[PDB]
Amino acid sequence: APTLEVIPLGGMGEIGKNITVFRYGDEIVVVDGGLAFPKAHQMGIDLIVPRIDYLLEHQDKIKGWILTHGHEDHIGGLPYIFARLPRVPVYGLPLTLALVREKLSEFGLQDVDLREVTYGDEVRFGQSFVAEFFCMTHSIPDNAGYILKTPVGDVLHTGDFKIDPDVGTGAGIVSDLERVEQAGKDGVLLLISDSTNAERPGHTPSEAEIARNLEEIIKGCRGRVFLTTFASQVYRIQNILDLAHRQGRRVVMEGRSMIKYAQAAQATGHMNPPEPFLTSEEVGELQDQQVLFVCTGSQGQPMAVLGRLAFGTHAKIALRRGDTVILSSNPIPGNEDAVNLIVNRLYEIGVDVVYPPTYRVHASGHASQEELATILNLTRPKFFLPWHGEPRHQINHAKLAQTLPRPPKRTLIAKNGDIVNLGPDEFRVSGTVAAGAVYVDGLGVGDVNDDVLLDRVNLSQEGLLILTAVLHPTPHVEVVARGFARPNRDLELQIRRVALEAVEQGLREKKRLEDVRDDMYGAVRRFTRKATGRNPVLIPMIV
Amino acid sequence: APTLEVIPLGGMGEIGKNITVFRYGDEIVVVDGGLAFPKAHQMGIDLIVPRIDYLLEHQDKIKGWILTHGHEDHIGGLPYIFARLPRVPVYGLPLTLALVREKLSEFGLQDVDLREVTYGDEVRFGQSFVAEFFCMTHSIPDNAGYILKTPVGDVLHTGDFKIDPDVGTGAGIVSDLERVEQAGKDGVLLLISDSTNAERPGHTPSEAEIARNLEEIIKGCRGRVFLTTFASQVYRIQNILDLAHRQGRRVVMEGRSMIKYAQAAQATGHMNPPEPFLTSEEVGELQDQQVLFVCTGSQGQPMAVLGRLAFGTHAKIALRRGDTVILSSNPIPGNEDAVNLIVNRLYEIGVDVVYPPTYRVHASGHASQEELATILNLTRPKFFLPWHGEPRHQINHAKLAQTLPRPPKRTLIAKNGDIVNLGPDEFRVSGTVAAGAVYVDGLGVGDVNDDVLLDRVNLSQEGLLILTAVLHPTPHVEVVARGFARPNRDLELQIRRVALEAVEQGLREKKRLEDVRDDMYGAVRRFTRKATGRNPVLIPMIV
């Protein structure tokens, strides 16, 4: 009998560019459309978006979109994805849509059909799908999980979550554990659950506790306080606004990215400054102990605000001895060096530096094992797909589920492109569809691929040597080096002879000019390797 | 009132390339000859060595050398340093000198005057200096701190250390806290102490505890075990050989680096294999649970042994489900991504993966705050130079000393090149000498500098377009690309129009060839920036 197909196109076996496809018959529902940020080896590129070959192929089957929350790994790919697809209904909570709308406006995309929903709303897609939204606490407001009701049963997707009893903003926001528990009693065929922190024992700390730690620290700061956190951590920022007021400090917000999230949050009633934000010039009128900066740059970006402060390149402010800088954040994996470098810059300036683990001034947005186990125990799913995690995270999430009273009948470790067939008693990967990464580099989408990146790597490691041989009047060779070594006239002449004698040997014994080009390349490679121990990229031209 | 000059040339404000200069009158004693390994922005280079300009200027004053232990950041620079200096006496413990002797023989360095010492020995350097060696436990055997006795008073240098009550090898190795306490009574004018773990609360775990943990884990492993650890962790590896024997496993050691430290340790009595090492062929004859591999690649190096295992490129062995892989190691800062990649490959293969913090299978070689506090308390120093750390470590070591019952009179945060004047009542930075880094890249020493690196970074990020224009017979342009973009005919045709017209427009008014470069190079970039939004490095050539 017809089965549900769950086809992740991004977000499985990685943390980033989340997009999941649900297909039943000839109807498709898509969930999120995130981006990913480039790793160190993906040099020069700006962002990464999902391959949507599947969706282009079946674009007439798409009934609509669900957007769980406004983080970049869930809505960042949308300008790129929507531009290639028919306009379809796109459902999300208010902050999420605010962020997407601003994003599409930057892109110049028009007539996108964004539909505001709220927790509890049940939305229908085509004839065989109904989605019901429910609240899960996360590190951004208006974050949803959903129950997807299908002819074969119910799929419960947690979205991104932690179980935070108190996010500290006085708005009574809590995860809808009652709805989750009910779904378990009703029957959950498939659980899709956030695996980010599946290797962390215990419970992720509460934002209320972080806020209390921050207030205690700041309360004891004698001078100015500079604080950095993620741009989109609206709860953390709001709580910081509240304690700043209590501690008699006015707030300056700096950094486009954070100002952008702040503006959206204020427009949707999730950010409420007790006192107006001030400019740096305005707070310059106050005493040091009355000053708090909230700004970007927690990941050590030299061009971000904290970056410019740490490197002494900020236009209007200079850090000094007696300042306190707080990193209310942790380095995203791969940013350790960048953050270490700014931290050391700060210590050399002489400012008091505050960061984890010495100070507990950050809580992750994701459930640790106790919280993951709670969702598993409440939902009691027959089948289980650990999601939003690299393989290490998915597999340890799967191991955690085995320890529980009522382990799932089968757990699968899905990969992007996997076709996961779901029936009342079916749970298997039946096949694969085209999936992967598309690089965005400046205006270019997909014009930079791995083969292009491979060159960039080689250039990066070994630098460049251009050998141009000129046959007339008498054959001579020309050497141009870029990022190879500093000028060395002796070696330059030495490289010329090696190429030349190979060029003359291709003339002493006639070969095609194309053949001789390869011959001198090989000679110069051998010499240089012996002479310098280096293997520079050599570009020979016999023209 | 002659003063002692303490001149760090490397190892202050960094972890790596330790070398410290002590000058009094016209006598110089040098301590250590370390390299540093490159960071991510120093692409393509193999290693980094100290600038020794100061020693070159003053080479006749050098009376002797002290070598505290055999780690790369204390002896790795020696082949490059000794080659430019007079052959002075070089004092060290036996394993230290065995490692140095191998290293110097590879470089062709003849007649280096290596002199073995033993703990407790007093070594005189000219009139002004007497040095006394003493034992500090570390993550390599034959590791020493020393007391340097000068006319102005006594300098105690901890060397690299932890305070490990039991390294587990049964040879009764302990730190000489008695001698250190006695130095405190005799009077310690200056204390130089290892700041590596100064931000870590508590006490670094004992190797004996790590060995017990490993044995408990390995006891439970149903099949083959693969364990990686630092090549020079002689204690850990010996402990593993003995636990392996007890658990009835035979041991294979692979990885050139590890075998190298193993051979020197064996030759100097610090490693005694209870059973002979077997080859991978030979263990292949045994049952799975009789097999233990000890190998390199703990840092994620794809070509190292664990690397090739994880990527499935090892010539003779293939990991499989049921295997257990233990990373008895932590990622050295900056290696997190490389190790994470290996770990995920291992999960995907399906092996059991054991690493910290989930399993306590690694302990640092360096003292945490409790151990640091002990040394400060025992030495009771008048002046304090926190050393072997980045500024964050140094300054946190300085704060730690302030919390203690008898804080130092003055503490300074030294930088490389600082002239620290030491008197009975003087402690200040009076001057600076030339200090810094020298890049080694293949055979070349100092032929790659920061300016060269800037280019490699540039190539790395934006790719390359070589652009050639010949005015004859009529103006035209030819293009070779590297790492810029995937082949696009429209883009390529369009770049030449900018390039050729600028040559033709440049041709209309007779122009110098160099003037053509400005129009030609300038034309493509102007266009290219509009077209792709990117700025590839361009090499203009007139044919």
Ligand SMILES: O=c1ccn([C@@H]2O[C@H](COP(=O)(O)O)[C@@H](O)[C@H]2O)c(=O)[nH]1
């Ligand atoms: O806005 C965010 C927040 C978190 N993360 C990353 O996703 C994981 C979860 O972060 P958090 O939600 O726990 O802050 C972490 O690895 C973090 O680096 C992001 O990329 N962007």
Ligand SMILES: O=c1ccn([C@@H]2O[C@H](COP(=O)(O)O)[C@@H](O)[C@H]2O)c(=O)[nH]1
């Ligand atoms: O390049 C290096 C080498 C060693 N360590 C330090 O060495 C300690 C582990 O002890 P050991 O086994 O490396 O001596 C760690 O705390 C680590 O900080 C570094 O940080 N960077």
Ligand SMILES: [Mn+2]
């Ligand atoms: Mn780019």
Ligand SMILES: [Mn+2]
């Ligand atoms: Mn190189």
Ligand SMILES: [Zn+2]
């Ligand atoms: Zn999120």
Ligand SMILES: [Zn+2]
């Ligand atoms: Zn997410």
Ligand SMILES: [Zn+2]
């Ligand atoms: Zn060491």
Ligand SMILES: [Zn+2]
């Ligand atoms: Zn060291």
